[PDB]
């Protein structure tokens, strides 16, 4: 009876093993565009991915993680609301059973078909395990997906999924360039929050891009052929692996843009 996204182990149950589920800075949240205030003091965001080294893609039974070499400062996020240097460790997605849901963050209650999370750790804490124990430990870049024109830079991800169908399967995933997954604009919302899966630690500076990327129906259909289950177990399609919006509580969402 491990946590997951089913009727018996889904987000409404998580607080039993992880009481911080009902904490003061949980994610995701609804971004109310009429409430989020332009902050003229936010610096522009610095996304430095030219030296990024992808290694591996893993079905962890909740999502698939594209993992990067984070042993030196190769792929980093700086500026915006951040102090210092945050190293890219992995990216993954959350997605729906259908195009009308799947994002974790919502915009004026609108759900996107999917949401990309590029997870970075603060290099002043030395390792990822120590960073998650700190309020400023992680920076997650959130990007909404909508369904329309294919995203070319996502296709190398889509075409390896056949090979990692079930929990615990991985494959070599070298030389993938995450710059191919960004929108044109780096206009963003920011607020302090948490991991959106157990252990739900309150260690994240959230940076959610305003401009979604387009992916094709055929691309997201291939996300929905993945399995939550391990090899030879009853097939549970990997769909609706999103946590719903949490109470904002004592928090301000700041906009990078007028
Ligand atoms: O990092 C993040 O992506 C936030 C999150 N935590 N688990 N899945 N997503
Ligand atoms: Zn995530």
């Amino acid at each position: 009876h491990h946590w997951g996204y089913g009727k018996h182990n889904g987000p409404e149950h998580w607080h039993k093993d992880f009481p911080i589920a009902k904490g003061e800075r949980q994610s995701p949240v609804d971004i109310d565009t009429h409430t989020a205030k332009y902050d003229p003091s936010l610096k522009p965001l610095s996304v430095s991915y030219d030296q990024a080294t992808s290694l591996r893609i893993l079905n962890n039974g909740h999502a698939f993680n594209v993992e990067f070499d984070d042993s030196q400062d190769k792929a980093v996020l700086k500026g915006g609301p951040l102090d210092g240097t945050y190293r890219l460790i992995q990216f993954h997605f959350h997605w729906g059973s259908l195009d009308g849901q799947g994002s974790e963050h919502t915009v004026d209650k609108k759900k996107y078909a999917a949401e990309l999370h590029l997870v970075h750790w603060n290099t002043k804490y030395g390792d990822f395990g120590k960073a998650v124990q700190q309020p400023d430990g992680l920076a997650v870049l959130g990007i909404f997906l909508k369904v329309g024109s294919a995203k070319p830079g996502l296709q190398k991800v889509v075409d390896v999924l056949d090979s990692i169908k079930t929990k615990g399967k991985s494959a070599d995933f070298t030389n993938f360039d995450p710059r191919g997954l960004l929108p044109e604009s780096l206009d963003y919302w920011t607020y302090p929050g948490s991991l959106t899966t157990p252990p739900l630690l309150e260690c994240v500076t959230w940076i959610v891009l305003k401009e979604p990327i387009s992916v094709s129906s055929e691309q997201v259909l291939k996300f929905r052929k993945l399995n939550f289950n391990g090899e030879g177990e009853p097939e549970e399609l990997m769909v609706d692996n999103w946590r719903p919006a949490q109470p904002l509580k004592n928090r301000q969402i700041k906009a990078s843009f007028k």
Side-chain angles (χ1 to χ4, degrees), residues 1-6 8-42 44-257:
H1 195 88
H2 199 257
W3 71 268
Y5 298 92
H8 299 282
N9 64 356
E12 297 309 287
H13 293 271
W14 294 352
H15 75 97
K16 293 182 274 183
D17 295 302
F18 307 93
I20 208 179
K22 307 172 109 79
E24 297 306 298
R25 56 170 284 190
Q26 289 289 290
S27 297
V29 300
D30 185 60
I31 303 167
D32 199 69
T33 62
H34 312 93
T35 289
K37 192 184 156 58
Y38 172 58
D39 176 351
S41 79
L42 289 167
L45 185 69
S46 183
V47 184
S48 301
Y49 284 175
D50 100 281
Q51 293 298 295
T53 305
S54 63
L55 291 180
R56 204 175 66 142
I57 193 177
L58 171 68
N59 182 340
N60 62 18
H62 312 280
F64 61 92
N65 280 10
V66 174
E67 296 164 350
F68 288 82
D69 180 12
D70 65 340
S71 67
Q72 318 174 255
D73 268 0
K74 305 187 142 208
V76 299
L77 189 65
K78 273 148 10 67
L82 306 168
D83 285 340
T85 294
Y86 290 72
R87 219 179 264 181
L88 181 68
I89 173 165
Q90 52 98 345
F91 69 77
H92 60 267
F93 303 79
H94 305 265
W95 64 90
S97 41
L98 293 177
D99 304 346
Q101 59 188 37
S103 70
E104 293 212 308
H105 290 93
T106 61
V107 182
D108 295 327
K109 296 300 173 69
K110 178 198 176 56
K111 299 179 171 91
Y112 284 92
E115 186 175 326
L116 168 61
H117 287 160
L118 299 119
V119 181
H120 313 77
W121 59 272
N122 194 334
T123 65
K124 70 198 195 93
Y125 301 122
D127 70 60
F128 177 89
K130 285 305 249 287
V132 297
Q133 298 169 234
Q134 306 294 342
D136 58 347
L138 291 197
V140 185
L141 181 55
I143 306 183
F144 298 115
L145 280 63
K146 62 175 201 200
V147 171
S149 305
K151 194 80 166 150
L154 183 60
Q155 193 58 39
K156 276 203 305 201
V157 171
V158 162
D159 286 328
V160 74
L161 297 180
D162 278 332
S163 82
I164 61 148
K165 197 177 178 202
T166 52
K167 176 170 16 79
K169 303 272 223 181
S170 68
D172 307 312
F173 208 67
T174 52
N175 295 294
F176 183 72
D177 180 356
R179 288 172 309 179
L181 293 180
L182 301 177
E184 260 180 38
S185 183
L186 293 195
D187 285 351
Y188 66 87
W189 297 284
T190 187
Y191 76 96
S194 72
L195 296 185
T196 67
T197 57
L200 298 169
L201 297 169
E202 298 187 331
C203 61
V204 179
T205 305
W206 272 100
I207 298 165
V208 182
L209 296 192
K210 169 204 65 182
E211 184 179 354
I213 63 168
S214 307
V215 306
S216 66
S217 174
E218 296 94 350
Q219 287 175 326
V220 285
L221 281 170
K222 300 200 145 146
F223 289 15
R224 298 180 186 142
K225 291 203 220 305
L226 285 165
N227 277 194
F228 282 126
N229 50 287
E231 182 182 359
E233 286 167 13
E235 185 166 32
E236 187 70 356
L237 294 175
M238 194 171 277
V239 294
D240 289 323
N241 57 350
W242 51 278
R243 185 193 195 190
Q246 300 303 307
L248 188 54
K249 294 210 169 133
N250 198 52
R251 294 180 289 178
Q252 246 148 31
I253 305 183
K254 306 278 209 189
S256 72
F257 62 91

